[PDB]
Amino acid sequence: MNIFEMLRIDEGLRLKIYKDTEGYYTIGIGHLLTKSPSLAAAKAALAAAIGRNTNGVITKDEAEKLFNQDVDAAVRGILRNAKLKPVYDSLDAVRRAALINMVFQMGETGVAGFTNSLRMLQQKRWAAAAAALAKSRWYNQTPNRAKRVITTFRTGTWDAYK
């Protein structure tokens, strides 16, 4: 198991524009297109990202090319961020995967705001961290995915995903 396989299970693969759990326009493997409620805006944002007039639809290869870009961006965002970096540095390889999963899903800024949790992770206080993460809006909005990620931090194994 690796970060790529982990995210393909959590995000799935959609070839047509859709609305996420927060109602935003998304496509491919969890690729946020826009936060604007306009479907034309989303379509526009899509053509720019693909470099082709698509009419709201993409090929599997396009989705994969967007996935590679977003995982790279997630990893680079972590490493660049003063709050995120030290946390990543401190962790084993499995738990590092969990943190990249969160960043991919809620952006650098979003995760950088989980102050209490990140400090507990850095102190290796597994149970306290899992319990704190369980009270977030994040958790309440997408509970099955969040529990998988949470269990990944709690345990340091890939069990939630076999």
Residues 55-114 interacting with Cl ion (rule: CB under 5 A): 114
Q: Which is nearer to Cl ion, 7 or 132 (CB)?
A: 132
- Residue 32 annotated as part of some ligand binding site: yes
Segment interacting with Cl ion, rule: CB under 5 A, options 9-17, 45-53, 60-68, 116-124: 116-124
> Partners of 26 in the beta sheet?
18, 32
Active-site residue, from 5, 10, 11, 64? 11
62 annotated active-site: no
Q: Alpha carbon 41 to chain centroid distance?
A: 23
Whose tokens are 């705001």? That residue is 113
Which residue's CB is nearer to Cl ion, number 53 or number 144?
Answer: 144
Across the strands, what pairs with 32?
26
Does 145 sit near Cl ion (CB under 5 A)?
yes
Residues forming a β-bridge with 18: 26
The number of beta carbons lying within 10 Å of the beta carbon of residue 86 is 11
Does position 132 interact with Cl ion (CB under 5 A)? The reply is yes
Using DSSP, how many helices (H) and how many strands (E) does the chain show?
9, 3
116 interacts with Cl ion by CB under 5 A:
yes
Question: Using the rule CB under 5 A, is 38 a contact of Cl ion?
Answer: no
DSSP 25: E
117 appears as a binding residue in the annotation: yes
- Whether 64 sits among the annotated catalytic residues: the reply is no
- Of the listed 20, 61, 70, 72, which one is catalytic? 20
Would you state the structure tokens that stand for residue 77, as one six-digit string?
């965002």
Verify binding: residue 144, Cl ion, rule CB under 5 A.
Answer: yes
As given in the structure block, the two tokens for residue 114 are 């989980």
Catalytic residues: 11, 20
Residues making up the binding site for substrate: 32, 104, 117
